[PDB]
Design an enzyme around this catalytic site. Sequence first.
Site, PDB file in Angstrom:
ATOM      1  N   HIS A   6      38.963  42.381  38.788  1.00  0.00           N
ATOM      2  CA  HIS A   6      38.678  43.210  37.628  1.00  0.00           C
ATOM      3  C   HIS A   6      37.470  42.746  36.792  1.00  0.00           C
ATOM      4  O   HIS A   6      37.001  43.513  35.949  1.00  0.00           O
ATOM      5  CB  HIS A   6      39.944  43.430  36.795  1.00  0.00           C
ATOM      6  CG  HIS A   6      40.199  42.443  35.685  1.00  0.00           C
ATOM      7  ND1 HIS A   6      41.115  41.425  35.698  1.00  0.00           N
ATOM      8  CD2 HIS A   6      39.625  42.440  34.450  1.00  0.00           C
ATOM      9  CE1 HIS A   6      41.104  40.815  34.512  1.00  0.00           C
ATOM     10  NE2 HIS A   6      40.209  41.427  33.731  1.00  0.00           N
TER      11      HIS A   6
ATOM     12  N   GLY B  30      38.488  37.892  27.746  1.00  0.00           N
ATOM     13  CA  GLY B  30      37.322  37.061  28.011  1.00  0.00           C
ATOM     14  C   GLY B  30      37.656  35.769  28.768  1.00  0.00           C
ATOM     15  O   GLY B  30      36.731  35.124  29.250  1.00  0.00           O
TER      16      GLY B  30
ATOM     17  N   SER C 154      39.625  36.207  31.469  1.00  0.00           N
ATOM     18  CA  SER C 154      39.895  36.794  32.779  1.00  0.00           C
ATOM     19  C   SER C 154      39.040  36.180  33.871  1.00  0.00           C
ATOM     20  O   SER C 154      37.875  35.884  33.649  1.00  0.00           O
ATOM     21  CB  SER C 154      39.650  38.290  32.767  1.00  0.00           C
ATOM     22  OG  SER C 154      40.604  39.033  32.065  1.00  0.00           O
ATOM     23  N   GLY C 155      39.643  35.946  35.031  1.00  0.00           N
ATOM     24  CA  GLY C 155      38.984  35.359  36.165  1.00  0.00           C
ATOM     25  C   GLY C 155      38.979  33.837  36.132  1.00  0.00           C
ATOM     26  O   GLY C 155      38.655  33.244  37.151  1.00  0.00           O
TER      27      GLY C 155
ATOM     28  N   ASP D 128      44.387  40.752  42.218  1.00  0.00           N
ATOM     29  CA  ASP D 128      43.263  40.572  41.312  1.00  0.00           C
ATOM     30  C   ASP D 128      42.475  39.291  41.608  1.00  0.00           C
ATOM     31  O   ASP D 128      42.509  38.326  40.845  1.00  0.00           O
ATOM     32  CB  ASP D 128      43.749  40.673  39.871  1.00  0.00           C
ATOM     33  CG  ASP D 128      42.626  40.794  38.868  1.00  0.00           C
ATOM     34  OD1 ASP D 128      41.482  41.045  39.282  1.00  0.00           O
ATOM     35  OD2 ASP D 128      42.967  40.667  37.681  1.00  0.00           O
TER      36      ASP D 128
HETATM   37  B1  DYB Z   1      40.293  39.655  30.857  1.00  0.00           B
HETATM   38  O1  DYB Z   1      41.479  39.668  30.124  1.00  0.00           O
HETATM   39  C1  DYB Z   1      42.312  38.520  30.015  1.00  0.00           C
HETATM   40  C2  DYB Z   1      43.631  38.767  29.286  1.00  0.00           C
HETATM   41  C3  DYB Z   1      44.657  37.647  29.525  1.00  0.00           C
HETATM   42  C4  DYB Z   1      45.972  37.952  28.808  1.00  0.00           C
HETATM   43  N1  DYB Z   1      46.968  36.897  29.055  1.00  0.00           N
HETATM   44  O2  DYB Z   1      39.219  39.002  30.220  1.00  0.00           O
HETATM   45  C5  DYB Z   1      38.020  39.756  30.199  1.00  0.00           C
HETATM   46  C6  DYB Z   1      38.397  40.972  31.021  1.00  0.00           C
HETATM   47  O3  DYB Z   1      39.802  40.948  31.094  1.00  0.00           O
END
Ligand code: DYB
Length: 223
Positions: free
Chosen positions: A40, A175, A177-178, A84
């Site tokens: 994502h 932020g 994420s990943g 993901d």
């Molecule tokens: B992610 O989102 C992360 C959310 C984590 C919740 N525990 O970061 C930037 C794009 O989606």
Amino acid sequence: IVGGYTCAANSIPYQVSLNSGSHFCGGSLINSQWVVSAAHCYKSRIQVRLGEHNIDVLEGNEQFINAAKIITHPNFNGNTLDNDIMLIKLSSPATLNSRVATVSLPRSCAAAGTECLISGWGNTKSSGSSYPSLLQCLKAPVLSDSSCKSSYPGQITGNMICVGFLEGGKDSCQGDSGGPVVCNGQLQGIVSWGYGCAQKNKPGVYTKVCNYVNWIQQTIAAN
Ligand SMILES: *[B]1(O[C][C][C][C][N+])O[C][C]O1
Ligand SMILES: [Ca+2]
């Protein structure tokens, strides 16, 4: 990261920042040429920033390396976020030193209650938003599949784990994420989603990295 602490500078040497004009996702260095992150987080063009602590200041350990290949899991579901995971091949190999290092792929799946380290430059506030210059860290345990499923009825696939605190206050957020979840020196989680962040009975949900060792090694061998 909400409810965490600022990491010691460069103490998480496998953490990268993915940058497209600004920081937008984390990733984990697993090979001198390869970063794992969340599907994502996909963009057509990504600059991988290794060796960062302050993403707003050149501190002198950074290596900025453009992605040459960006490969999402073939069964990534952009709606549910099942599978993901994605792999980024760097245009040149990262130089490995004390500040830029690989993290091991997992030997097995982590037991419930295994202590892990979650990191990133995501939102630090549960009420509102604040985006840090400095890499944030959070100690958190792997939750049982039962606890994970009871928090998100019908939403947790075999490719997802929960890590965090059911009471609230300590979680990854927008932020992060990943980015990595590392337990006993092994990458067990990729920051994926949750119902908001740090809410009671809504722990973070993470891609279950111990399902993907074959796919990762296949992808490295093929590219
Ligand atoms: B992610 O989102 C992360 C959310 C984590 C919740 N525990 O970061 C930037 C794009 O989606
Ligand atoms: Ca910097």
